[PDB]
């Protein structure tokens, strides 16, 4: 199937208490592999996956030097934006940047990304064509014109199609045991009485990879979306994910209800029933 590499950067200003905080995280699909924390002692890009630990000093020094340049650009960027929005110096503000690439099942370039946020709102984003910008507001127009005139998008298209795809492919190859695996969900059901005439039926999906999953409940094969309590897919902490879906069932109607589990790890989707 398809794969992706994503880098997420968060810069938070700290008025009256030193330099802004800067965190970089890198992911390959749903697995994190690198980190940089401006508040940590190391001052280096660090491994967060076992398959990148043995990359070597040339990889490590280079990622450290580049991520250090990212911190300085954002440090300046915070000053620029506070100016653009006519804001006070005593307020804490947030700049977020995300970039990466999506490859198909054929392992070649499919989609590119490079976008910014300011205080949780979209600031600027590179469009799908990788040649044009989307400036969400009036203040963002200066950046949009500054980058259009400097032909910034051309340089961004070169990284997203080349280096990003090349390195995504190399990490997919090196971390083959974990990234190319498909852990199908381990399923179970629970039954608890709400009252004397009702009961909750909870459908569990555990220890699965990747995170993408569909959990649905049907009464006689008919849709029960509006009556299913559904939790956000959550990380187990061991590299796998969890999800549950629950319906309130009138006692004695347990046999009408079926839970359906859709996941890449299942050749055929599972149909579960309380019996």
């Amino acid at each position: 199937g398809s794969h992706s590499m994503r880098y997420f950067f968060t810069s938070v200003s700290r008025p009256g208490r030193g330099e802004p905080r800067f965190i970089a995280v890198g992911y390959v699909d749903d697995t994190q592999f690198v980190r940089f924390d401006s508040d940590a002692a190391s001052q280096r890009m660090e491994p967060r996956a076992p398959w990148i630990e043995q990359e070597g000093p040339e990889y490590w020094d280079g990622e450290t030097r580049k991520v250090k340049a990212h911190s300085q650009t954002h440090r300046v960027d915070l000053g620029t934006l506070r100016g653009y929005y006519n804001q006070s110096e005593a307020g804490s503000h947030t700049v977020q940047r995300m970039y990466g690439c999506d490859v198909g099942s054929d392992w070649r370039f499919l989609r590119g990304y490079h976008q910014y946020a300011y205080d949780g709102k979209d600031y600027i984003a590179l469009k799908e064509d990788l040649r044009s910008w989307t400036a969400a507001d009036m203040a963002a127009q200066t950046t949009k014109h500054k980058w259009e005139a400097a032909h910034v998008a051309e340089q961004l298209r070169a990284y997203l199609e080349g280096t990003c795809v090349e390195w995504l492919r190399r990490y997919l190859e090196n971390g083959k045991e974990t990234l190319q695996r498909t852990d199908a969900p381990k399923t179970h059901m629970t039954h608890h009485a709400v009252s004397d005439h009702e009961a909750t039926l909870r459908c569990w999906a555990l220890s699965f990879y990747p995170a993408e999953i569909t959990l649905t409940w049907q009464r006689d094969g008919e849709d029960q979306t509006q009556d299913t309590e559904l939790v956000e897919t959550r990380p187990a902490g061991d590299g796998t994910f969890q999800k549950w879906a629950a319906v309130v069932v009138p006692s004695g109607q347990e046999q009408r209800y079926t839970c359906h589990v859709q996941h890449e790890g299942l050749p055929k989707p599972l149909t579960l029933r309380w019996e």
Binding site: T80, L81, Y84, K146, A150, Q155, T163, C164
Partner: peptide, 9 residues
């Protein structure tokens, strides 16, 4: 691998 580039808002 992260980008080299370096551009300002």
């Amino acid at each position: 691998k992260v980008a080299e580039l370096v551009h300002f808002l």
